Amino acid sequence: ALYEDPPDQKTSPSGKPATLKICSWNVDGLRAWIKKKGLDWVKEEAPDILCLQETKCSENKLPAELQELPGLSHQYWSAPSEGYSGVGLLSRQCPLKVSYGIGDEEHDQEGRVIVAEFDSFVLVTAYVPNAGRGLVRLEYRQRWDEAFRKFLKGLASRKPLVLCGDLNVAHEEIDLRNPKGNKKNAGFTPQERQGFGELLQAVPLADSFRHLYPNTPYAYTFWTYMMNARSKNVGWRLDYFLLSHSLLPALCDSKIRSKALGSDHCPITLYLAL
């Protein structure tokens, strides 16, 4: 039933030390997050880049603490034109360029994607549309998936890419506690899984965590608040660090910060040697 993230690996396979630390998190509401000390966590983590999903808070209504963030001061935010969706990206270093959405008006209205370009790569963070209760949004989800894939594909074609976020899909069975009982629930439908795989193959992208821990069970990033889930380790692996194959060599580690509190999701951290 248990999962214990292994120790941070801070050198590349080739022996180069990690130079870049990226942390991703779905915070389930900025203010609620800050409230249940998420900020303090970040402080200890001290990433160079911080990607947040589910801010459910507009840039105009941003909490004060945030701007103060000492080591991460170039901050961008996107949210629907309050209390729903929205994403953010905070960096130690200033990106070459920041953009939003995926270039498709239909999919660009809920503040779900930020694109930040750096020297040696491009970083995309996203909070993916959930299929919903009763798979009522499944069809929309599928359209999204296709449009996203295409977008990413074009991006990668130009610059090596790193994609992170809450992708709202447990890839395979090993990716969740109860595959059987979830095949018809958002996040584990065949449609969704299929989409993910396509993403992988088509971009193409590699699943960082899975790449390093191919046979590791019990490793989740989301547990429903309900019915004591987190406590019983009844979760899903919904958050990823997807990488362009060319970055594999620069890969040091992909972590799952199990114990970090503040949301129904836990953070994930990526170490790259650039």
Is 265 annotated as a binding-site member?
yes
User: CA quadruple 35, 5, 219, 14: dihedral positive or negative?
Assistant: positive
Cβ of residue 274: shortest distance to Pb ion, in angstroms? 29
Residue range at the interface with Pb ion (CB under 5 A); choices 16-24, 101-109, 164-172, 188-196: 164-172
Which of 145, 166, 175, 239 binds Pb ion (CB under 5 A)? It is: 166
- Our CB check for Pb ion shows the closer of 3 and 84 to be 84
Cβ of residue 33: shortest distance to Pb ion, in angstroms? 11
Question: Long-range contacts: 182-188, Cβ < 8 Å, 24+?
Answer: 184/135, 185/135, 186/130, 186/131, 186/132, 186/133, 186/135, 186/137, 186/138, 187/130, 187/131, 187/236, 187/238, 188/236
Active site residue 225: no
- Residue 239 touches Pb ion, criterion: CB under 5 A: no
Cβ of residue 55: shortest distance to Pb ion, in angstroms? 11
Cβ of residue 28: shortest distance to Pb ion, in angstroms? 5
Out of 28, 166, 239, 253, pick the active-site residue. 166
Active site residue 166: yes
- Our CB check for Pb ion shows the closer of 55 and 91 to be 55
Cβ of residue 142: shortest distance to Pb ion, in angstroms? 17
Is 26 annotated as a binding-site member?
yes
CA dihedral 214, 176, 258, 239 (to 10 degrees): 80
Is 166 annotated as a binding-site member?
yes
Tokens representing 133?
């209760």
Site string for Pb ion, 28-47 (x = CB under 5 A): x-------------------
Active site residue 171: no
Question: Long-range contacts: 146-154, Cβ < 8 Å, 24+?
Answer: 146/195, 147/102, 147/104, 147/106, 147/107, 148/102, 148/107, 148/199, 149/195, 149/198, 149/199, 149/202, 149/203, 151/102, 151/103, 151/104, 152/124, 152/199, 152/203, 152/205, 153/202, 153/203
Q: What is the DSSP letter of 189?
A: -
Q: Is 94 helix (H, G, I), strand (E, B) or coil?
A: coil
Residue range at the interface with Pb ion (CB under 5 A); choices 5-13, 148-156, 165-173, 207-215: 165-173
Is 54 annotated as a binding-site member?
yes
Do 130 and 137 meet the contact criterion of CB atoms below 8 Å apart?
yes
- Our CB check for Pb ion shows the closer of 28 and 253 to be 28
Out of 28, 76, 127, 220, pick the active-site residue. 127
Output the known binding site: 26, 54, 166, 168, 264-265
- Binding-site positions for Mg(2+) read 26, 54, 166, 168, 264-265
Q: Which residues are catalytic, by number? A: 127, 166, 265
User: Site residues (CB under 5 A) for Pb ion?
Assistant: 28, 166
